[PDB]
Amino acid sequence: PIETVPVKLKPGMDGPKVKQWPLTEEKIKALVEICTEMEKEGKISKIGPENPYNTPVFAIDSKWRKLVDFRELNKRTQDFWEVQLGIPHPAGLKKKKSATVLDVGDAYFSVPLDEDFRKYTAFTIPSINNETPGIRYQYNVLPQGWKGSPAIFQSSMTKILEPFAAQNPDIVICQYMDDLYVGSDLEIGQHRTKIEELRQHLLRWGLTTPDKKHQKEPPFLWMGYELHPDKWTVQPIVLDSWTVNDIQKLVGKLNWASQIYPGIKVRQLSKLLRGTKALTEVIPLTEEAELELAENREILKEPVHGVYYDPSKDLIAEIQKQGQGQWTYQIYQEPFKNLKTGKYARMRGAHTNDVKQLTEAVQKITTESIVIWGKTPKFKLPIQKETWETWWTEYWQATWIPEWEFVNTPPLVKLWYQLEKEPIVGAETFYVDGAANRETKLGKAGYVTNKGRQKVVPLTNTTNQKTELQAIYLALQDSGLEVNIVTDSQYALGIIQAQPDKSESELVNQIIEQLIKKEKVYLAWVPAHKGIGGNEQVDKLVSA
Amino acid sequence: IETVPVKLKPGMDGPKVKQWPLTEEKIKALVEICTEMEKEGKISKIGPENPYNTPVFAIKKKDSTKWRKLVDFRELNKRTQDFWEVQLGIPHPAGLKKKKSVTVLDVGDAYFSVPLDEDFRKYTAFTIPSINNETPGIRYQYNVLPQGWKGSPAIFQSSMTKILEPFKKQNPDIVIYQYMDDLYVGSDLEIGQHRTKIEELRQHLLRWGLTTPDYELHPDKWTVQPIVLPEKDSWTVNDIQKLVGKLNWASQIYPGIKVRQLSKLLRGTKALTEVIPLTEEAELELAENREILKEPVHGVYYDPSKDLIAEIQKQGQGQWTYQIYQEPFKNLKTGKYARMRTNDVKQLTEAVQKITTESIVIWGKTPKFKLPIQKETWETWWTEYWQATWIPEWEFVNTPPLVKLWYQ
Ligand SMILES: N#Cc1ccc2c(Oc3ccccc3OCCn3ccc(=O)[nH]c3=O)cccc2c1
């Protein structure tokens, strides 16, 4: 009785036409038996040779089911509105007095197929002997392996549910694939009463559900979770094997555990998986990564459970700086009962700031909260309000953080150095510069100072930008606690101005370490080759 | 009513844009708004054979309790409106900028009476999202002219001209321009007379069936931010170095700038804090450049076939500077906004809407902004402070303008 969804093929393409591969006669009789039963129930109907289209059929106790390869038909079938890939996260669920799983049987076969599209779903039963022409059929309902069957089933289920949902606004119905998860806070008696009403309502539309064979409430082993009536957790995770693929599956299991297990670290192991591409290839076990596996095994020994969600209470997210470039966070409402946990790693890039990384993690957690709970959390962050205010006011970019409160949990996020906004009086003025020959990959760096100091160092395997940064480093090393540096390198000025906390460049890190020891540093920029006095002198010294 | 046939540009498929996650309050508002719209026939629910989708958001729009639906038709417009810009385009009045006062009215409710071509409605598909993927999203398509779609004002243009003809005849001195969903009404009258005329126009539309919701721009006061060199009694080496850098920069915008005599001051390896007397030749060189910078820039013309580009820089203390250009150093306009004192994002959002409004009034076109903010930050919170019925195109610059601001 369900209304059909009009379906069309892609404009350029046309219906499939494939040849059926031969098969064993025992399978052929089995396919014959299966197709005769389906024909009786209206699911499939025999066709003549007027139809030109065919797609290959196959057969696979404990078994002998029918499989059809619709890949060609799928390639020719229009795109649909895709079903939702994201699965409900258990931490987003609200505790309910009772909750029931009503899985739908033969779900696709209950829903009709567009009459004009049925022709393309045509299949030919293999003939037992090559001499006879095989029997031919066409689907009248949604084929199992077809592109539009998942989406058309979902829309049909939504239509069937909409009236009953309005009649019973108290009941909460969740749709995921063929399963319908129903929760409520009625008394146990009225819950079963409405569950039975829902079962009857689906039956009028030809959808069948378990009755008193419903899955048991404690062992909700759903999509890798345990859904207890009072809590949720990750299903038990196992894990020594050193193949590349074995490492990848280990890292996946650790990430999946990190939803609720705090402190799971994967940074060292992720460095092991660096485009090797050889799943069989064994990897050397760095002691840094090998210890990392040991730490996780200690954590995984502790059984961890998460709580469900309470709309009346506030969402709190708290973030801890773990290591370098790694951040860990917990989201909770009650003081020690966590809704879930997670990690955020430094996004790819060099010259990063701990303050900048913290903001991005706040950004990531904020978006995650909206997906799961529909509101944004209150944050507990390991940064002083004085540090953040200094950073935002002087930062070149527009930044914002929601309401937050300092937590004195070290390590604390701090600005390791701050540059001077005005030239320092009584401080030596270093005019630095660098240059290198691109073909030779060789160059030089140095400085010329107001007091007459000068220096040039020879360099090898360097680029022009590296020399420009190197000259700044040379001045920093050969300077007192207060120094004024004048450069023409926009590249150099930009890195230093961004106040990077660290980087992958050992030179930049050295510059950072020199900058932190300095009491005051002022960096000024001047146009190159414009006749500025100090810059002109150093340019001849470095490049010649 | 008959429906104008509408076609996407050839070799184009309808928009397939991901719905950004929403808050529970915004989802609840959107379901309430769309429930009523479906009853009135403006929209209706759609099946899974419609693969297209366009984002939907909810803005307060300065209404204390009223929630407004905003559809982000930027992708559909790019695939539709350019064809509609030529065939059914709308002219732009060069005098709206000259007018003393311009008021902006929302005429979006007008479009809902005119129907849309049945072969085009599928491209107007949007999805009301769901929390934690607990339910499939509610899916609708428009049966009438959508509010954010640039084809809607083009189709209604005939009906708008008929409705406004009586008022325009009685008030020939008032300029009326229609950018998508909005009516820009410009007068040179006193504000109280202008305000009374505006209410008269609102009543006129209401009598003819166009409901108007229940700001005041002053384009004559608008002036560009001119380049201004510092004026000092004593100059440090740092001062002269910065002056050389700023003058060197302005050479790209202003031909005629000289830094020869001023650079000669900087001969030698002197300390930054050292005061330098200015040679009379350099004093002349600095004075000459000031006059060159004092003169308004000349020789930049708006090319309608090109995009406009808006760059924004975060100055301190709530100030923002911006430049609108089509060519890298040929600026059609530059300005500076000061905040009343507010989140940086709220300030940036306000800046973007102010610039777009000015760009609409001046050129009848919206610029593509280069926003100095992280993408995820902007995507999460731009809707919070957004009051406009349109959405400009934007991109994100994560590279700091390490080059000194030199925009004040
Ligand atoms: N298998 C399976 C299965 C079963 C129920 C699901 C589900 O069940 C629910 C359906 C509607 C509303 C709340 C739901 O769960 C809230 C959390 N919860 C969950 C289970 C339980 O006993 N008690 C409990 O308070 C919500 C989401 C996914 C579910 C998956």
PDB file of N, CA and C in Angstrom, chain B residues 336-383:
ATOM      1  N   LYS B 336      37.309  52.820   7.130  1.00  0.00           N
ATOM      2  CA  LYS B 336      37.638  52.346   8.467  1.00  0.00           C
ATOM      3  C   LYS B 336      36.394  52.417   9.339  1.00  0.00           C
ATOM      4  N   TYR B 337      36.082  51.315  10.012  1.00  0.00           N
ATOM      5  CA  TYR B 337      34.979  51.257  10.957  1.00  0.00           C
ATOM      6  C   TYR B 337      35.524  51.230  12.376  1.00  0.00           C
ATOM      7  N   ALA B 338      34.866  51.961  13.265  1.00  0.00           N
ATOM      8  CA  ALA B 338      35.152  51.922  14.691  1.00  0.00           C
ATOM      9  C   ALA B 338      33.945  51.343  15.412  1.00  0.00           C
ATOM     10  N   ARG B 339      34.193  50.406  16.321  1.00  0.00           N
ATOM     11  CA  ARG B 339      33.111  49.831  17.101  1.00  0.00           C
ATOM     12  C   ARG B 339      32.635  50.818  18.164  1.00  0.00           C
ATOM     13  N   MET B 340      31.409  50.591  18.646  1.00  0.00           N
ATOM     14  CA  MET B 340      30.882  51.413  19.730  1.00  0.00           C
ATOM     15  C   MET B 340      31.756  51.323  20.974  1.00  0.00           C
ATOM     16  N   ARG B 341      32.423  50.190  21.174  1.00  0.00           N
ATOM     17  CA  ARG B 341      33.384  50.038  22.257  1.00  0.00           C
ATOM     18  C   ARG B 341      34.736  49.602  21.707  1.00  0.00           C
ATOM     19  N   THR B 342      32.421  43.842  22.958  1.00  0.00           N
ATOM     20  CA  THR B 342      31.951  43.165  21.756  1.00  0.00           C
ATOM     21  C   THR B 342      32.979  42.141  21.272  1.00  0.00           C
ATOM     22  N   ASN B 343      32.486  40.968  20.885  1.00  0.00           N
ATOM     23  CA  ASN B 343      33.334  39.919  20.336  1.00  0.00           C
ATOM     24  C   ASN B 343      33.984  40.376  19.032  1.00  0.00           C
ATOM     25  N   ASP B 344      35.222  39.920  18.814  1.00  0.00           N
ATOM     26  CA  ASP B 344      35.887  40.153  17.535  1.00  0.00           C
ATOM     27  C   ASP B 344      35.057  39.614  16.380  1.00  0.00           C
ATOM     28  N   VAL B 345      34.497  38.413  16.542  1.00  0.00           N
ATOM     29  CA  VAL B 345      33.668  37.824  15.494  1.00  0.00           C
ATOM     30  C   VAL B 345      32.441  38.689  15.237  1.00  0.00           C
ATOM     31  N   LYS B 346      31.804  39.178  16.305  1.00  0.00           N
ATOM     32  CA  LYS B 346      30.659  40.069  16.140  1.00  0.00           C
ATOM     33  C   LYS B 346      31.060  41.358  15.433  1.00  0.00           C
ATOM     34  N   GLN B 347      32.231  41.902  15.767  1.00  0.00           N
ATOM     35  CA  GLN B 347      32.733  43.073  15.054  1.00  0.00           C
ATOM     36  C   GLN B 347      32.986  42.754  13.586  1.00  0.00           C
ATOM     37  N   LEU B 348      33.631  41.619  13.314  1.00  0.00           N
ATOM     38  CA  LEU B 348      33.922  41.246  11.934  1.00  0.00           C
ATOM     39  C   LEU B 348      32.640  41.015  11.148  1.00  0.00           C
ATOM     40  N   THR B 349      31.663  40.340  11.757  1.00  0.00           N
ATOM     41  CA  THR B 349      30.378  40.128  11.099  1.00  0.00           C
ATOM     42  C   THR B 349      29.696  41.455  10.786  1.00  0.00           C
ATOM     43  N   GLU B 350      29.724  42.397  11.733  1.00  0.00           N
ATOM     44  CA  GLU B 350      29.138  43.710  11.485  1.00  0.00           C
ATOM     45  C   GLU B 350      29.872  44.438  10.368  1.00  0.00           C
ATOM     46  N   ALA B 351      31.204  44.353  10.357  1.00  0.00           N
ATOM     47  CA  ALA B 351      31.985  44.972   9.290  1.00  0.00           C
ATOM     48  C   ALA B 351      31.591  44.416   7.927  1.00  0.00           C
ATOM     49  N   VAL B 352      31.441  43.091   7.828  1.00  0.00           N
ATOM     50  CA  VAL B 352      31.135  42.468   6.540  1.00  0.00           C
ATOM     51  C   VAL B 352      29.792  42.954   6.009  1.00  0.00           C
ATOM     52  N   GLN B 353      28.798  43.087   6.890  1.00  0.00           N
ATOM     53  CA  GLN B 353      27.481  43.537   6.449  1.00  0.00           C
ATOM     54  C   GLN B 353      27.494  45.014   6.070  1.00  0.00           C
ATOM     55  N   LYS B 354      28.257  45.835   6.798  1.00  0.00           N
ATOM     56  CA  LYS B 354      28.361  47.250   6.454  1.00  0.00           C
ATOM     57  C   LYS B 354      28.988  47.432   5.076  1.00  0.00           C
ATOM     58  N   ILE B 355      30.072  46.701   4.803  1.00  0.00           N
ATOM     59  CA  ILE B 355      30.761  46.829   3.523  1.00  0.00           C
ATOM     60  C   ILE B 355      29.873  46.355   2.381  1.00  0.00           C
ATOM     61  N   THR B 356      29.189  45.226   2.568  1.00  0.00           N
ATOM     62  CA  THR B 356      28.299  44.717   1.528  1.00  0.00           C
ATOM     63  C   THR B 356      27.195  45.721   1.224  1.00  0.00           C
ATOM     64  N   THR B 357      26.592  46.291   2.269  1.00  0.00           N
ATOM     65  CA  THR B 357      25.563  47.310   2.090  1.00  0.00           C
ATOM     66  C   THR B 357      26.080  48.466   1.241  1.00  0.00           C
ATOM     67  N   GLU B 358      27.276  48.964   1.567  1.00  0.00           N
ATOM     68  CA  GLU B 358      27.871  50.046   0.792  1.00  0.00           C
ATOM     69  C   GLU B 358      28.168  49.602  -0.633  1.00  0.00           C
ATOM     70  N   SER B 359      28.665  48.375  -0.794  1.00  0.00           N
ATOM     71  CA  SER B 359      28.949  47.857  -2.127  1.00  0.00           C
ATOM     72  C   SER B 359      27.672  47.691  -2.941  1.00  0.00           C
ATOM     73  N   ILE B 360      26.571  47.309  -2.290  1.00  0.00           N
ATOM     74  CA  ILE B 360      25.293  47.230  -2.993  1.00  0.00           C
ATOM     75  C   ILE B 360      24.840  48.620  -3.421  1.00  0.00           C
ATOM     76  N   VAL B 361      24.870  49.580  -2.493  1.00  0.00           N
ATOM     77  CA  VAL B 361      24.414  50.932  -2.802  1.00  0.00           C
ATOM     78  C   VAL B 361      25.257  51.544  -3.913  1.00  0.00           C
ATOM     79  N   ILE B 362      26.577  51.383  -3.837  1.00  0.00           N
ATOM     80  CA  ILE B 362      27.459  52.063  -4.780  1.00  0.00           C
ATOM     81  C   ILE B 362      27.446  51.389  -6.150  1.00  0.00           C
ATOM     82  N   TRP B 363      27.515  50.057  -6.197  1.00  0.00           N
ATOM     83  CA  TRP B 363      27.723  49.344  -7.453  1.00  0.00           C
ATOM     84  C   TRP B 363      26.644  48.327  -7.799  1.00  0.00           C
ATOM     85  N   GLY B 364      25.677  48.084  -6.920  1.00  0.00           N
ATOM     86  CA  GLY B 364      24.711  47.026  -7.176  1.00  0.00           C
ATOM     87  C   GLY B 364      25.344  45.657  -7.284  1.00  0.00           C
ATOM     88  N   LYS B 365      26.368  45.394  -6.476  1.00  0.00           N
ATOM     89  CA  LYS B 365      27.092  44.133  -6.523  1.00  0.00           C
ATOM     90  C   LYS B 365      27.715  43.886  -5.157  1.00  0.00           C
ATOM     91  N   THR B 366      27.855  42.610  -4.808  1.00  0.00           N
ATOM     92  CA  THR B 366      28.484  42.302  -3.524  1.00  0.00           C
ATOM     93  C   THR B 366      29.917  41.830  -3.736  1.00  0.00           C
ATOM     94  N   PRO B 367      30.846  42.254  -2.889  1.00  0.00           N
ATOM     95  CA  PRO B 367      32.235  41.810  -3.031  1.00  0.00           C
ATOM     96  C   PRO B 367      32.441  40.436  -2.415  1.00  0.00           C
ATOM     97  N   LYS B 368      33.554  39.816  -2.799  1.00  0.00           N
ATOM     98  CA  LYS B 368      33.999  38.564  -2.198  1.00  0.00           C
ATOM     99  C   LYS B 368      34.995  38.917  -1.103  1.00  0.00           C
ATOM    100  N   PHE B 369      34.622  38.659   0.143  1.00  0.00           N
ATOM    101  CA  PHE B 369      35.452  39.066   1.263  1.00  0.00           C
ATOM    102  C   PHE B 369      36.607  38.095   1.472  1.00  0.00           C
ATOM    103  N   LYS B 370      37.727  38.638   1.939  1.00  0.00           N
ATOM    104  CA  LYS B 370      38.863  37.849   2.417  1.00  0.00           C
ATOM    105  C   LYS B 370      38.935  38.066   3.930  1.00  0.00           C
ATOM    106  N   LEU B 371      38.368  37.127   4.671  1.00  0.00           N
ATOM    107  CA  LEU B 371      38.125  37.304   6.101  1.00  0.00           C
ATOM    108  C   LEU B 371      39.347  36.887   6.906  1.00  0.00           C
ATOM    109  N   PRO B 372      39.872  37.750   7.780  1.00  0.00           N
ATOM    110  CA  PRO B 372      41.003  37.380   8.663  1.00  0.00           C
ATOM    111  C   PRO B 372      40.530  36.648   9.920  1.00  0.00           C
ATOM    112  N   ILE B 373      40.163  35.377   9.726  1.00  0.00           N
ATOM    113  CA  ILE B 373      39.623  34.550  10.800  1.00  0.00           C
ATOM    114  C   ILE B 373      39.659  33.087  10.365  1.00  0.00           C
ATOM    115  N   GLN B 374      39.820  32.173  11.318  1.00  0.00           N
ATOM    116  CA  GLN B 374      39.804  30.748  11.013  1.00  0.00           C
ATOM    117  C   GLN B 374      38.430  30.323  10.503  1.00  0.00           C
ATOM    118  N   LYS B 375      38.429  29.439   9.500  1.00  0.00           N
ATOM    119  CA  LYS B 375      37.184  29.041   8.842  1.00  0.00           C
ATOM    120  C   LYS B 375      36.183  28.464   9.839  1.00  0.00           C
ATOM    121  N   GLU B 376      36.635  27.531  10.685  1.00  0.00           N
ATOM    122  CA  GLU B 376      35.724  26.874  11.616  1.00  0.00           C
ATOM    123  C   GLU B 376      35.136  27.868  12.611  1.00  0.00           C
ATOM    124  N   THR B 377      35.951  28.819  13.074  1.00  0.00           N
ATOM    125  CA  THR B 377      35.440  29.882  13.932  1.00  0.00           C
ATOM    126  C   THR B 377      34.316  30.647  13.243  1.00  0.00           C
ATOM    127  N   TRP B 378      34.553  31.092  12.005  1.00  0.00           N
ATOM    128  CA  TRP B 378      33.548  31.874  11.294  1.00  0.00           C
ATOM    129  C   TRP B 378      32.298  31.054  11.005  1.00  0.00           C
ATOM    130  N   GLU B 379      32.473  29.800  10.576  1.00  0.00           N
ATOM    131  CA  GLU B 379      31.328  28.953  10.259  1.00  0.00           C
ATOM    132  C   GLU B 379      30.466  28.689  11.487  1.00  0.00           C
ATOM    133  N   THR B 380      31.089  28.581  12.660  1.00  0.00           N
ATOM    134  CA  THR B 380      30.345  28.274  13.876  1.00  0.00           C
ATOM    135  C   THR B 380      29.496  29.456  14.336  1.00  0.00           C
ATOM    136  N   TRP B 381      30.009  30.683  14.213  1.00  0.00           N
ATOM    137  CA  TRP B 381      29.386  31.807  14.895  1.00  0.00           C
ATOM    138  C   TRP B 381      28.931  32.958  14.002  1.00  0.00           C
ATOM    139  N   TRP B 382      29.109  32.884  12.677  1.00  0.00           N
ATOM    140  CA  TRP B 382      28.683  33.999  11.830  1.00  0.00           C
ATOM    141  C   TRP B 382      27.173  34.205  11.899  1.00  0.00           C
ATOM    142  N   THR B 383      26.405  33.114  11.964  1.00  0.00           N
ATOM    143  CA  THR B 383      24.951  33.227  12.019  1.00  0.00           C
ATOM    144  C   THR B 383      24.486  33.977  13.259  1.00  0.00           C
TER     145      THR B 383
END
